Point group: C2
Chain length 159, copies 2
């Protein structure tokens, strides 16, 4: 039984870091960012503009999604990432976490949810995930991250 | 007698707001944001840089830009604003040239700029187009219903 929680607790910053570290898609610098967002929500609240949906089983965090409203826009949101622990990864939890983010974005009047990823081979699964969830590749910024590493911007119309 | 400066002084937060106010293009809250960025630089480092254009004791214009997080050599041009008495005199292009020079010197590769596709932003669009930027992406209805975001790309090296 997976439970979805939106309230950020003090235990979360480190639990998120461990989730992020278990996936292999986060360099230490990226895992630092992942944890910092949880801490800023603890040191401010909703004010930081970072929202979370944590998937838990017992006292363990199976995975989570991080998202927020896009600055200077009306009804546009960014999905920062969905991270699931390796042992809960072929469980449909990723799609469940995205469904919850979409529910939340719809409730606050959102029209769009954007996700950005890399165009390299390693990110092929992530792109499939987004495409299977109904996101459409709307923009490609060539060599955005580095030579040969393009940024692909995926769009999901929510309303 | 135009000079270029990059050290953020306490006095600049208000001068920048005034450059933004002088144009008559932005809301008082948009001017608030511009002033806030200058102030946030003074208190930090904060991820962005400035190039101020000045004629005598007055700020004629400025540019605000910074490195794109999580990229190697990608930069974002946040804002370039020139006062009405500096408009159409090439100060905007000159400020953009300074940003591009500073970005190239830090080993930068790309400079992106973003604007709206609404009627009011046509001059901004033309300015970037005239400067060598190419429209690489359009995210439809991005800022609000019917207001698309155009992402402009400038290869600097």
């Amino acid at each position: 039984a997976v439970a979805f929680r939106r309230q950020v607790l003090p235990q979360d910053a480190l639990l998120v870091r461990r989730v992020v570290e278990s996936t292999g898609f986060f360099t230490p610098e990226e895992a630092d960012v992942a944890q910092e967002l949880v801490d800023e929500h603890l040191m401010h609240g909703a004010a930081c503009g970072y929202h979370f949906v944590f998937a838990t089983e017992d006292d363990d965090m199976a995975g989570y999604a991080c998202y927020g409203p896009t600055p200077a826009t009306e009804g546009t949101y960014d999905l920062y990432w969905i991270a699931v622990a390796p042992h809960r990864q072929h469980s449909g939890l990723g799609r469940a976490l995205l469904a919850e983010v979409v529910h939340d974005v719809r409730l606050t009047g959102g029209r769009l949810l954007f996700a950005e990823t890399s165009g390299i081979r390693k990110y092929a699964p992530t792109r499939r995930f987004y495409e299977r969830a109904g996101f459409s590749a709307e923009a490609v910024l060539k060599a955005f991250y580095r030579a040969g590493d393009d940024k692909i911007i995926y769009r999901l119309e929510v309303a």
